[PDB]
Amino acid sequence: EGREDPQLLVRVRGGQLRGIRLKAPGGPVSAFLGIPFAEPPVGSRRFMPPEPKRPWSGVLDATTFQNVCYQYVDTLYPGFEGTEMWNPNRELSEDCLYLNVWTPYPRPASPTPVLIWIYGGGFYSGAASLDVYDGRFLAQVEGAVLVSMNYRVGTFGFLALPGSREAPGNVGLLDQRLALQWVQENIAAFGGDPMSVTLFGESAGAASVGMHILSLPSRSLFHRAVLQSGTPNGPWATVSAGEARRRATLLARLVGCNDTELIACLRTRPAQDLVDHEWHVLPQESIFRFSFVPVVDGDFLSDTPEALINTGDFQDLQVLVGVVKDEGSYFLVYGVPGFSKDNESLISRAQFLAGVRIGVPQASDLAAEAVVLHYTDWLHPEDPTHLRDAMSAVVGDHNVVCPVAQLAGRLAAQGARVYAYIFEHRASTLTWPLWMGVPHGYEIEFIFGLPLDPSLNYTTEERIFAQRLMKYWTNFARTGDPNDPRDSKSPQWPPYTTAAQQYVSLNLKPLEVRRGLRAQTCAFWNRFLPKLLSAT
Ligand SMILES: *[C@@H]1O[C@H](CO)[C@@H](O)[C@H](O)[C@H]1NC(C)=O
Ligand SMILES: *[C@@H]1O[C@H](CO)[C@@H](O)[C@H](O)[C@H]1NC(C)=O
Known part of the structure; x- marks a missing residue:
């Protein structure tokens, strides 16, 4: 360092970061984009619960949005803003577990309340890097500390052979939970108050927030919740274990595939093969119904959200x-x-x-x-x-x-x-x-x-x-x-x-x-x- 901007170097549990001064209408904000948070859930790690990011050396550059989690890209109306605005705006990759922090510039003096955004997209799409999730206005005008993370969607995030070791299910929810822990451990370095953490989210984001409420280990990670247009209960946000096993083995068939061997085979498919067939496993012709969603596993979710x-x-x-x-x-x-x-x-x-x-x-x-x-x-x-x-x-x-x-x-x-x-x-x-x-x-x-x-x-x-x-x-x-x-x-x-x-x-x-x-x-x-x- 030395010629660098002093208000943009921060240290977190995994190492040093360099952020970026961003212009908001009424003044500058600090942005720390693409902070790792987990070991890249690729290769033998596909379908697996996330492991914490192993610490790096040197100063990790955190000035840009990282990869978007592998997903189906919408082309119903090519070129139309109304659809494009929800489309991935960074490279699709399985190595996608990164999160972003926006804070006032210079960062707050006292501990500031933290908002954590969880995007929606039916558990099959989404990204924390979309323009409409830009945390710079909330950071500049309200002095908030805003955090948002990527979590695995679709098969990668939700395919489950319930009971198994290699595809337990709900790992996308686990991705979210690990980012919550990360905020607990590290947000103090940005001037955030780990004791005032509010979850908010929309659609499958709201259903996600809802499931954190209903899952004990998540409960200690936040204090208040905002659910916009979505709930953990309801017809689309969860599947029984039986139905998840059914969809997983059907999709395995459609791509060419004992739980261990089944999953081992799936792990050798290009990510795009999985995406190309994920819509072919639904029981009926339907709208507002998605193939791979949170499963009632008796673990993350001890019972149906209705019962809970x-x-x-x-x-x-x-x-x-x-x-x-x-x-x-x-x-x-x-x-x-x-x-x-x-x-x-x-x-x-x-x-x-x-x-x-x-x-x-x-x-x-x-x-x-x-x-x-x-x-x-x-x-x-x-x-x-x-x-x-x-x-x-x-x-x-x-x-x-x-x-x-x-x-x-x-x-x-x-x-x-x-x-x-x-x-x-x-x-x-x-x-x-x-x-x-x-x-x-x-x-x-x-x-x-x-x-x-x-x-x-x-x-x-x-x-x-x-x-x-x-x-x-x-x-x-x-x-x-x-x-x-x-x-x-x-x-x-x-x-x-x-x-x-x-x-x-x-x-x-x-x-x-x-x-x-x-x-x-x-x-x-x-x-x-x-x-x-x-x-x-
Ligand atoms: C509008 O377009 C759809 C699809 O092209 C068509 O099925 C439908 O009949 C149209 N509706 C009207 C009001 O013409
Ligand atoms: C806003 O309006 C101006 C004037 O018509 C136009 O040139 C500009 O492209 C607009 N911006 C957007 C993205 O709507």
């Missing part, structure tokens, strides 16, 4: 949870006939019934009849616009809104302090059609404060709105409460309770308190459907 949230004590827990206005619309273009981004997607009643068998793949004929009956508007049963929106609502309600509603309810009933929102603002810069409303994933760019970036063409009220969201999120990280102690009456954001079931609306207008999270309809999905399904 039903019988757990969450006195210690403060949680923020929410959903967007149109959770389901995004997935319709990815496998429901009639639906496209290039037209208004007005569908027929026939395409609706067909769409329901796809979005509720596990339903008997009677179950599918119930759904179609519930969602049909009997004043206008054949109206193409209503059917289009009912289809979107079916998918949204079954997968997110009702699992979220049920999650808030059980956690509040059992000690947790829970805050709940519905995010209702459609970004002015959105490239998906209007019929999709506010799709899944589109609050993220507001929470991370992207609209503060002059060159982004957000409106001024969008910029002010982003500052509010950043405030709510960072206050909650700081205190377990979204509300500003200073700022009095905006109005206040009330905890969610079984009694009153209040949540707030997040949009350009001020906080408005509403009651009941699709209460009537969630009773269908959460109380009736299960019983109907178990009697058919």
Whole structure:
């Protein structure tokens, strides 16, 4: 060193790092990108739980985002920003277990509360390096310490032969957990407070956060959790051990393959062979269903998340949870006939019934009849616009809104302090059609404060709105409460309770308190459907 910038050299358990001074709108931030955190889970290590990064010598350069975990790359709409923005933006590799830290510049004087972001992408895609996960705005404007990590997705992260030694399952969750430990051990070197760690995540990121809550060894690694548009409970976020074994041995067959020999063979396949077949192992034609997800192994997850949230004590827990206005619309273009981004997607009643068998793949004929009956508007049963929106609502309600509603309810009933929102603002810069409303994933760019970036063409009220969201999120990280102690009456954001079931609306207008999270309809999905399904 010597001519280097003195505010960018930091030491962590594995060695010395050199970070980078980054420009944010209102001033500079410190960034430490591509910090190892684990031994490259390649070769004989594929499908295996991660081992801690062996210490290096010299100064590790931490000025750029590292590899993105090997994954399927989306090409439904080549060149279209709306899809490309979620695509990998660094080389795909199995050597991908790296994490990133953003902090104020110079780094904080006192210990600062830490936010840990866990990306979503259905457990088959994702990266902590995407522009919408840029932690520099939260670091500069809120003085937060923001951390985000890569974890293995798809087969690499979730293929399981439960019981086995060489593919125990859930290793992607283990990847996340090791980064949590890493933060405990090392974040003090950046001015972070290991005693104020808040998890937040979206979609499969939210379901991930949720599983850390329900898994003892993770519980000591963080203090508060934010779950955006996802839950550990619900139809897509986990598979039984039987079903995971089924999918693993089927995929093994499709690529050309006693657990040990099976896995040993899989370990000799190019990573792209695994990706090319991972979608061919699903039981039914489906949307919002992913081949390789967290498995109920009786280990990381001691029981189903349903059983765990039903019988757990969450006195210690403060949680923020929410959903967007149109959770389901995004997935319709990815496998429901009639639906496209290039037209208004007005569908027929026939395409609706067909769409329901796809979005509720596990339903008997009677179950599918119930759904179609519930969602049909009997004043206008054949109206193409209503059917289009009912289809979107079916998918949204079954997968997110009702699992979220049920999650808030059980956690509040059992000690947790829970805050709940519905995010209702459609970004002015959105490239998906209007019929999709506010799709899944589109609050993220507001929470991370992207609209503060002059060159982004957000409106001024969008910029002010982003500052509010950043405030709510960072206050909650700081205190377990979204509300500003200073700022009095905006109005206040009330905890969610079984009694009153209040949540707030997040949009350009001020906080408005509403009651009941699709209460009537969630009773269908959460109380009736299960019983109907178990009697058919
Ligand atoms: C929109 O496009 C899809 C796929 O190309 C097609 O199946 C559907 O019928 C179209 N919808 C309308 C309203 O024309
Ligand atoms: C913002 O608007 C300007 C003016 O039309 C345009 O030149 C620029 O490319 C826009 N930026 C983005 C990425 O939307």
